[model samples]
Target chain A: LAELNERLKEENFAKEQIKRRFKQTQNDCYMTFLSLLPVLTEPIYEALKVEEITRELQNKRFTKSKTQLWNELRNQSITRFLTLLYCESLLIVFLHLQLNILSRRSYLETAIQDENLAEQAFLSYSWWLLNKGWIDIKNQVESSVEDIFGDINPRQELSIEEFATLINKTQQIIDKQIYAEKSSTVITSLLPPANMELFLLQQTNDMEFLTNFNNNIQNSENVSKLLNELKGYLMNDQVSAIISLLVTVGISKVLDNIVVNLMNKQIPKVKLASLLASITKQSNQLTNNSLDNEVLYTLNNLQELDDLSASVYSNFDA
Target chain B: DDDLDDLDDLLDDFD
Candidate 1:
C-alpha cells in the first residue's frame, strides 16, 4: 500500500482522494465527474466528495457493486501459471539440444516481453544462476566439456596443461564478448528483464564437440600439424565410432533434464507435450543419426578437409 | 506474497 500510494503521486491524487475518484470512475468515467487536475477548485472537489459518501445512504442502497482489491494478484498468478505451461515445456528440448540454444533464448525473451510474471520469474532465476556460476564453462570444463575435443583427435594425446591453456583462452573470448559485460541488476531492471532458462542456457551452451575442436588448436596449420602428429593410433572407422559414442552421451545429459522438469511438473499439466515430444523425437533421431551415412561421411570429409564442423553452425554459439 | 502482507492482516482480523 505504501509503494502503491507513493506511485499514485505521479498522477497528483492522494490515496483517499484517488479511492473516491476511482469509485466514481467505476460507474461514470472519472473525467465526466472531475475535470483536469490543474484546474480543479477545492469547492468542486468538496462538492463531489460530499455527494459520493452520502449518495447511497440517501437512496437506502449501496453505491459500489464490487471491488478489485486482489485482482492484480489473481491475474499475476494466472499469467505465471500460463507461462510456466508455455516456457517450461518448450524450453526443455531447446535446453537439451546444443543446436537450439539460440532459438531457445529468443523464445524466453518473447515470453518476458509479452507477460510481467514471466519477466519477474525469468530475471529472478537467471540472475540467481549467474551469481552461482551454474552456467559457466570455467567451472564445468572438467566434468562434461573438458575432454570433448581431445577425445575426437585422441591420437594427438593433448596433455592436461595443453588442454587447460586452450580451454581457458577460448572461454576468455566468450567471456569478453557476451558474459563479462552483462550486469545482472541492469538486465533485471530493463523492460524485458533477464531471461531464466535462456540466459542459463547461454552460459554453458554450445555444440561442445565442434567448439572444442576449433578452439583447441592455434590455427588451420596447427590443425594440419596436429593431425600429422597423431600416431595413426585410431583408424578412421574407429574415429567415427568414438565420435558417435561421445556425441550421443553429451546429448543425453541435456535430454535427462527434460525428464527431471517433467517429473517435477515445472510445466504443470501436459499442456505442451506435443512440442516436447517432437523435440524429443527429433533430438533422439539426431543423436542416433550422428553416425548416419551422409553425416558420418561429412564428419569424415571434415577430417579430410582440415575440416569444418556443423551441428548447427551459429556464431552466437560462441 | 509480500504484496499481500497488509491484506493478510485485514483477513486475519475477520477470523
Candidate 2:
C-alpha cells in the first residue's frame, strides 16, 4: 500500500503535466487551422497565405520550447491524426460537404451484424464521395471565377483591389449553391441510396466520433501520406509508435476523472488502495523513459487518494 | 474592409 502511494504520487504529477501539454497541443492545432482558413476558403486568391502558414508552422518561433513535447506528440498516430480529423470535420462545414470518415464508419458499424449490407453500404458511400463530394467541390472551386480574369496567372501577383474583386465573385458562387439554405429535396438529391442514407443519419448526434475511426481510418500507405500531409515530412515510424503510448495516457486520465468521481459517490469511505485496485488494470504513466508495456503499470492512486480523503477540502476538483 | 466582410459572410453562411 505504501509503495502504491509513492507510485501514484509520481503518476498524478505526471498527469498534471500531461493535461497541460494536451491543452497546449489543442491550442497549437486551433491556431494552425485558423491560419489555414483564408487559404482553403479562397484557394486561388489567398494562395500566398497558404505558403506563409506552411513557412511559419516550421519556424522555430512557432515550435519553441514545445519542441520537446511536440517531438513526443508528433509521432503518436492519434495526436497527428486527431488534429487532422478535427480539421477535416471542420473543413466540411465550411466547404459545404457532409461525407466524412465518421459517417463512413457508422455506415459500416450499423451493418456489422449483417456483413452483406455493410460491404454494400461501404461501396455506395465511397462512390458517392468520389463522384459528388470530391469532384463537385473541385469544380466549384475551379469555376468560382470566370474568363478574362478566369485564367489568372499564378506567376503574376494580383493587386489588392483586383484580388478583392475575384474574392467577391468567388464568394458569390460559394454562397448561392453551396451555402444557401437548403430544402429536404435539395439535400436528398445529393445523398446516396436510402439504406446508406439511413446509416449516415445516425452520425448527426454522435459526440464521440473519433473513438474508433474512426481507428481503422488509415492503413500503412495512408498513414505515411497523412504524416507527410501534417508536417510536410515524416519521422521514423518507430517514433510515431512511441507517441501512441502518450495517447494512451491522455485517454486514461479522462476516464480516471469519471471513475474517481463515481467511486467516491458509491462508497464514500473507500480506502486509497481499494479505490486504486478498482481502476488500475491498464492505467500507467509515460515520460522520457523508454517504451515497454512491462514498464507501464496500472494506477493513479494519488488522485484517488484525494477522492478518499475525509476532509471537505479535497483536491478532487482538479 | 469589404473583402473581410465577404469572408465573414462566407463563414457565417456555414454557421
Candidate 3:
C-alpha cells in the first residue's frame, strides 16, 4: 500500500510539471505575437504612395482650373490615403497573428484535443478584438480625414503655388491631428509607451529625411549625380550615408546661393574654400553624433522588446 | 477568464 501511494504521488507531480510547461509555452506564443505587431504594421505607411502624388503635382505645367486641381487633390488627400493604410494594416496584423498562432500550435505540448480548444479560444479572442475594436479606429481616422480636408474651395484658376500651398497645409494639419494624435494612440494600444515613442521618433526621422531630400533635389546643384547617388544608397544598407549626402548637397546649395547674392563683392576663392571646409567639418560632426545616438537608442529598444517577451510571458498567460 | 475579459476591455479604451 505504501509503494502504491508513493507512485500515485509521483504521477501527480509529473502531470503538474506538464501543465506548467504547456501554460508557459502558450504565453510565449502570445507575447511573441504581440511584440511583432508594431514591426509588421509600420512599413505600411510607405505604401501610402505620397511620392507618386507629389511627383504628379510637380510635373504640372500650365495653370489649371481651380475646379480641376481641387478634384485631383481631393482624390489624393493624404488623410484619406492614411485612413486606408491604417485599416489595411490592422487587417494584415490580425491575419498575421492568426496564421502565426495556428502554425505554432505544434510546439505546444498539451493533448492535441486540448490544443484545438485553446486555439479556438485564442482565435475567438483575436477576432473579437478585431471586430469590436478596429471599426472605432477606422471611424476615427475617417472623421479626421473629413475634418482636415473639407475646407478648400474649387472656384477659380489655380496656380502651381496655390495648389502646392493647399497640399502643404493639408499635410501639416494631418501631421498634427492624425499622425501625432491618432497614430500615437493606436500604437500605444498595441505596445508599451516607450516603444510607441520610438516608433514615432523613427517616423519623424523619415519625414524629415523626405523633406530635406525634396528640398535638395529642387535647389541643389547636379541633379543627375544626386539621383544616381540616391539610387546607390537605396540599393545598399547605407542609410546614414544617404543622410550625409543630403546634408552635403543642401549646404553646397546654400553656399552657392550666398555666392550668387554676393557676386558684386569679390571674396577670395581661398577664403571661400576655407569657409566650406569649416562648415563641412561641423556638418559631419553633427551628423555622426545624431546617427550614433539613434543607433544606440534603437539597439536598446530592440533589447527591451526581447526582455519584455520573456518576462511578459512569465507574468501573463494566454 | 477574468484576465481575458480584461484584455478585451482594454481594447475599448484605445480611442
Candidate 4:
C-alpha cells in the first residue's frame, strides 16, 4: 500500500482516486469506462483491497450488475481451472523446443538486417515476446541490454576480452535508451501488476540478447569475426566455458536462478514436496540434457549466412 | 507451501 500510494503521487488517476478523476476526464464511450485503471475494480477493488478478488465479486453492486460481472468472473475462474487440468499433460520437453526457436530467431536477427540491424533486433524480439509462451513476458524489458560479443573470421575476429568490452558498451546504451524511457518502468511495473503470470515471467527477463544481437554487430569486420567465434564454440563441448560464457555474454544471473526455478518445476505434483531429491532420475536427466542441448544449439549455429546469398558464379555484372 | 517470505522475495526486484 505504501508503494502504491507513492505511485499515486505521479499518477493522479489511481484506483483510489479514480471516481474523482473520472469526473474530470471527458469520457464519452462506456467501453472506455472499463478501460480506466482504477475502474477495473474501483469501489470493489477498494472494498476488497484487504481481500482477494473472489470476495469482492460477491458485493451487492456486483450481484445487481446488468453487465454480468458475475458471469465474467465465473468464466475467468473456470478458464483458469481448466488451464491447470493440462498442467501435467503438456510435455515439459516442448519448452526446450521453444528455447531453440527463440535462440535461432535471435541469432538470425543478430546477424542480418534489411536496413538497420539494431532496429531489427529490437522489433523482432518484441514481436516474439507477445506472440510467445510463458516466460516471454520477461523478454519485453529484458532484451534491450548491450552484450559484447567476440567473433573470429579468416578476415577478422572478436576475442573474449573484446566481447566483454562490447557488452559493457551495450549496457551503456540500454541505460540511456531503455532505462531512461517509459519502457524502464512499464515492463517491470505496470504490465506485471496487471497479470500474475506476466509478473512471474519477468523474473527471467534477459534484455542483453537484443542489444547484443549478433547480426546487429555495428562493425562489419567485428560481426564476421564474432560469427566465426560463435561457430567454434558451437562445435566444441565447452560445458563450463559455455556456462561461464553465458554469464560473460550475458546470462550468469539467469543461470543462477535455474537450480531453483527450472529444476523444481520439473517435479511432478506428487514429488513436489520432495523437490530437493538428488537422484539422477531419467526425467531429471532428460530435462537437464534437453536444456543443455538447446543452449548449445543456440550457441553453435553461427556458421549460416544470414540470408541465402548463394550467388556462386564467375560472372561480372555490366 | 508456508514461506511468507516468498512474497517478499518475489516482490524483490532482482536486477
In DockQ terms, which candidate is top? 4
True contacts kept of each: 0.00, 0.00, 0.00, 0.00
Arrange candidates by DockQ, descending.
4, 2, 1, 3
DockQ, cand. 1: 0.02
Q: Which docking class does model 1 fall in?
A: incorrect
What is candidate 4's lDDT per residue for B1-15, written digit by digit as tens? 223223122111111
- List RMSD in Å for every model shown: 32.2, 24.5, 24.2, 26.5
Please identify model 3 stretches exceeding 4 Å from their true place: A1-76, A88-112, A124-136, A152-308, B1-15
lDDT of 2 at A11: 79
What docking grade does candidate 4 earn? incorrect
Provide the lDDT at A213 for model 4.
44
Task: Give the Å error, residue A34, model 4.
Answer: 34
Residue by residue across A5-47, what tens digits does model 4's lDDT show? Answer: 8877746644434333222221211122223212222322232
lDDT of 1 by residue, A188-207 (tens): 21112223343442443345
TM-score for all predictions? 0.17, 0.24, 0.28, 0.19
User: What tens-digit string does per-residue lDDT give for candidate 3 at A151-249?
Assistant: 543233344334334434543443343234433433332222332322332343455443453444332233232223322322332322222222233
Error of 3 at A159 (Å): 17
Candidate 1 chain A weakest lDDT stretch, 10 residues: A85-94
Which residue ranges in model 4 land beyond 4 Å of their true spot?
A: A1-53, A61-67, A83-93, A98-318, B1-15
